[PDB]
Amino acid sequence: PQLPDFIQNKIDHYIENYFDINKNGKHLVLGKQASPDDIILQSNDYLALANHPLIKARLAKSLLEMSASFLQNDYDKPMIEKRLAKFTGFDECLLSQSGWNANVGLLQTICQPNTNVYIDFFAHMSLWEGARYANAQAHPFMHNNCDHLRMLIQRHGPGIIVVDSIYSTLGTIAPLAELVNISKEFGCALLVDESHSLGTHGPNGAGLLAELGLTREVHFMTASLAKTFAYRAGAIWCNNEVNRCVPFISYPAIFSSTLLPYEAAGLETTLEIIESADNRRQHLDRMARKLRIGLSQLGLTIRSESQIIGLETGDERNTEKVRDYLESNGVFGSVFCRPATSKNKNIIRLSLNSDVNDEQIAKIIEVCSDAVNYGDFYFR
Amino acid sequence: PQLPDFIQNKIDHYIENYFDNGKHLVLGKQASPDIILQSNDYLALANHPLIKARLAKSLLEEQQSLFMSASFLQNDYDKPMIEKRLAKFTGFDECLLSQSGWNANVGLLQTICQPNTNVYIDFFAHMSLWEGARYANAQAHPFMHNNCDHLRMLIQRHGPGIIVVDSIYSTLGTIAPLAELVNISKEFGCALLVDESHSLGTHGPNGAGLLAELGLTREVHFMTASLAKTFAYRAGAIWCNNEVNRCVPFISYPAIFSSTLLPYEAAGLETTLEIIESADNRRQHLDRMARKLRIGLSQLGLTIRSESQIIGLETGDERNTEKVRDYLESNGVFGSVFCRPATSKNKNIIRLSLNSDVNDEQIAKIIEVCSDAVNYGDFYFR
Ligand SMILES: Cc1ncc(COP(=O)(O)O)c(CNCC(=O)O)c1O
Ligand SMILES: Cc1ncc(COP(=O)(O)O)c(C=O)c1O
C-alpha cells in the first residue's frame, strides 16, 4: 500500500533533511557503536543503580507470585506513594506512568484555557506540551532570568511558574529561592520538575528544594522516576488537594493503563538504597566539579553546576564532527538537537554517574583538550 | 503554600461537582472473591507462570543501563528482537515499540500529520486518536459510528486524508466495517490507521488480529495496539507497511522525550507472544462465552451493540448510572463505569469486559442479575 502523496511527500522531505545529509546517512543522534572500555556518559542512572542486586532481587520476587482511575480507593493506592511524600517532605504523592505523564497530567489538572504559564525557555518539553494541550497561555522567560519573569508576570497577571530544578540539557540550576519569593510576591503557583536533582541532591537524596529548605513554599513538585530511581515511571507531589483530582482529570491517567502492582514494590527498595547512598552522591558531586573545572579552563562554555555537562557545539554539521571526534576517541555523550534544541544551538550532553572514575574524568578532559586543538570543528 | 484563586476554585468546584457515595462515579463498593469484568486481560495471562518466569529471568543482568530516550537506541543492534517478531506475527512490514498504546497513537499521528492534514475519525475512536490528531493540529472530520456512507461524503468534500478507526471499539465493543473501509481508502486515495487494541490476540489466525482474520493486512497502511490488553503489558506498538517507523522515533515527542522500555521488558513480551500464538482454545472459549452473554442480554430488550468480548450497558445519565452500578455491584457484578470525559454526560456506559476465565455458570448469573434489573425497577437503560 503506497503512501498517499500527503504523507509520502512529508516523509521524503524528512528523510532527506534529517537522515541523508549526515555522513553515515543516519539521524544525527546515531553514532558509532561503543566498545569496552569506552567511556559512556549517556544514562540518566546517576547513582548507577540499574544493575543493583537488591533492587533486581526485590523486583523479581514481587513479579513472581486498567486505568488507575479505578484504583483510587484507599486500599488500592500503593504504599510507595506515602513513603515518597514523606521522603520529599511534600504532603501528597501520586504515581504516574512516566515523568512525561506526570507533567502533562498535572498541568491538565491545574490549568484552564488561557491560564498564564510562565515557563523557563529551557524547561523540559513535557512541560511545554502539557501547557499547550491544556490550551494555556505560555509565556517563555529567558533562561534563569528573573528580571524577564518579573516583567512577564507584571504584564500578564497571576499564573503558574514552571522550571526544572536542574536543567536536562545544560545542567544549570534554577534560582529556586528567588523563584519562591517571586511567586509569593505575585500570587503565582510554583511547579518544580526535580527529575535531575531527586536522589542526587539534598538530605538522603530528597532533592534540591529539600536541600535549600524550600519544600513548604512550593505548591507542586514533579519528577521522572527514570533517572536516579532507574525506573520507567513518574510522580506528582502536592502541598495541597490537587492529587485527589489528577487521577480523574489527566488524560494519561484516565485513558492509559496504570503501573502494575509489582512495579511499586521495586520502587520501595530503590528508595531505601537511594536514602543511604551518601557516598555515591558525594563522589558524583566531586567528579562532576572536577570535570567542569577541567573543561572550562579549555575555553569551552560550561554552564553546568551539576552532574549534567553540556558541550555547546553550535550547528548540526559542526556537531556531527565533534561527536565523531569524541566517539573516535572513546567518549560517548548524547547529541541533543532539534526539536530538543534550536537547529543552531546543539548540545552534546555528558551525563555523569557515580561509577565514573578519576582516571576516566582526566581522560575526558584530555580528549576534549585535544579536540580544542584539532581544528576540525569548534565549541561555543 | 496557599494556592492562587484560579487553581483553588477549580479544585473546589471539581470536588463538589464530581465527588460530592462521596467518591467519583467510577468508584463503587469493594468486591469479594463476585464476578469481575473490568480487566482487559482478555486471555487471562496476567499471572501466567511462563511469562513471569521469563520476565524474572531477563530481569537479571542489566549491563544495559539504558535510561534514556529510545531515539538514541535506533541502531540495528539496539532494536529489540520483539519488534521483528511482532511484525512477522501480524503480517506488517515493520513494528516499533512504544511506552503505551496512548503514545503509539499520539506518536504515529504526529509523524504522519501536517497541520493541514484531513483526519477522518470515527466518532467513537479512542481518545488517544482524537488527541493525537489535535496535538498535530490536524483537521479532524468525525464520521458517525461505523457509517461508511457518512465517511464517503466527508472525503468527497475534503479530499485525501487519514481514516482512523478502532477495529473493536473500547466502550461499545462494536466491530468496524474494515473491509469496506479498505475499499473506501483505495477509492479516494487515503491512508488507513486501525487501532487493534481490543482485537490483537483475541481474533484472527493465532491471534494475529482482525485485519489478519479478514485478509486485509497487505491493504492497510498502519495498525496500532496497546499491549496492555491481551498482551497484559504496559506498552504499545506501531506497525507500518511502509517506512514511517523509520521516522517516528525521531519525530514523536513521547518517543523523543520520555524514557524507553527497558530491555528486560521486551524479553517478557517475546514469551507473551508465544503463549498468545498457541492460545486457540482460550480464544474459542472467550468467543463462545461472549456470544452467549450477548444473545442472553439482547433477550431482555437491552440495547447491546457489541459483537465482541466487550459489552456495554447503556445507562444514560450519571444519576441513572450510579443506580445501575450499585444494583449490579450489590448482586455481584462488576462493572466498569465509563463517563465523561470518555463519554457524553448523558450517555454513560457500564462496560462488561469478558475474559477466557469466565465460565458458563458466571454468564448465566450475569444474564440473571441483568434480567432482574430489567426490570426490578429503580432505573432505566438506553
Ligand atoms: C526535566 C525532565 N522532566 C521530565 C522528563 C520526562 O521523564 P520520563 O522519561 O519519565 O517521561 C524528562 C526526560 N529527560 C530525558 C533525558 O534527560 O534524557 C526530563 O528531563
Ligand atoms: C482502542 C484503544 N487504543 C489505545 C488505548 C491506550 O492504550 P494504553 O493504555 O496502553 O495507553 C486504549 C486503552 O484504553 C484503547 O482502548
Side-chain angles (χ1 to χ4, degrees), chain B residues 89 200-209 273 275-280 283:
Chain B
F89 175 61
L200 210 195
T202 50
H203 294 70
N206 301 342
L273 176 62
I275 296 299
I276 288 170
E277 277 185 314
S278 70
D280 286 5
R283 280 174 198 112

Side-chain angles (χ1 to χ4, degrees), chain A residues 66-67 97 101 251-252 254-258, chain B residues 40 42 98-105 124-129 165-171 195-199 224-229 233-237 310 338 351:
Chain A
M66 65 191 312
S67 164
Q97 309 98 329
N101 289 0
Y251 283 175
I254 294 166
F255 294 106
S256 199
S257 75
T258 186
Chain B
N40 303 131
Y42 296 127
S98 182
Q99 307 96 332
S100 60
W102 177 280
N103 288 5
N105 284 339
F124 287 103
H126 196 252
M127 182 68 80
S128 59
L129 294 160
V165 298
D166 289 10
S167 60
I168 299 186
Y169 285 84
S170 51
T171 303
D195 185 330
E196 287 221 42
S197 296
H198 301 276
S199 55
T224 66
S226 170
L227 257 19
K229 309 299 185 277
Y233 203 73
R234 181 169 63 95
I310 295 173
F338 276 91
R351 179 179 77 184

Side-chain angles (χ1 to χ4, degrees), chain A residues 46-114:
Chain A
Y46 299 127
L47 299 183
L49 301 177
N51 202 47
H52 197 290
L54 284 180
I55 298 175
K56 297 200 318 190
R58 179 77 188 273
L59 256 180
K61 215 205 322 290
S62 277
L63 85 84
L64 277 344
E65 96 190 331
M66 65 191 312
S67 164
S69 296
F70 302 106
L71 303 183
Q72 289 310 300
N73 283 305
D74 311 333
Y75 48 86
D76 280 328
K77 296 174 60 57
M79 272 278 310
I80 178 57
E81 285 178 352
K82 290 301 179 64
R83 294 187 54 88
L84 280 175
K86 172 177 294 188
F87 176 56
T88 217
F90 276 77
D91 291 337
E92 306 276 10
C93 177
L94 176 65
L95 254 272
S96 184
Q97 309 98 329
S98 62
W100 173 282
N101 289 0
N103 283 341
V104 159
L106 176 56
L107 286 170
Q108 176 174 9
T109 305
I110 63 177
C111 284
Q112 294 180 314
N114 294 126

